[PDB]
Write a protein that binds this ligand. Structure first.
Ligand SMILES: O=C(Nc1ccc(Cl)cc1)Nc1ccc(Cl)c(Cl)c1
Ligand code: NA
Length: 129
């Protein structure tokens, strides 16, 4: 599977952005789609994930309630809705995907090496007015 992400750019504090990530091959029942973000100077840090079969989601504390991942109703992809953005959210946002190992909870998929497949990144800079 290849992952394709939408554009980013500059946004202002308090604004929302809805990113898209689309897979080249149809989701499997075991597909997990994750979002990470590379804060400048830092590793790719986990944002949230979705389990395709159940639509179950899990998130990092730093984005809980503000960022929502959902499965597309009419495409083979997900959205990341990013609300109430602040300058500290400036990063490259990455879509990633995995196939869940039997016996491993989907919500355990929170680390970079848990995901073999990566999108190309969407750079977002949030600035004050
Ligand atoms: O992973 C997927 N689909 C998928 C769909 C949408 C998103 Cl956002 C992310 C992933 N299917 C798949 C199908 C076949 C193979 Cl070999 C593999 Cl390795 C993966
Ligand atoms: Na950090």
């Amino acid at each position: 599977v290849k992952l394709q992400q939408s554009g980013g750019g500059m946004v202002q504090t308090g604004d929302s952005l809805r990113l898209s990530c689309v897979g080249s091959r149809r989701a499997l029942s075991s597909t997990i789609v994750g979002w990470f973000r590379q804060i400048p100077g830092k590793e790719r840090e986990f944002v949230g994930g979705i389990a395709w079969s159940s639509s179950d989601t899990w998130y990092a504390d730093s984005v809980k309630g503000r960022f929502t991942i959902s499965k597309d109703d009419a495409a083979n992809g997900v959205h990341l809705q990013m609300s109430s953005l602040k300058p500290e959210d400036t990063a490259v946002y990455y879509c990633a995907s995995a196939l869940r190992r039997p016996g491993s909870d989907a919500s355990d998929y929170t680390r970079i090496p848990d995901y073999p497949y990566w999108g190309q990144g969407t750079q977002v800079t949030v600035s004050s007015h």
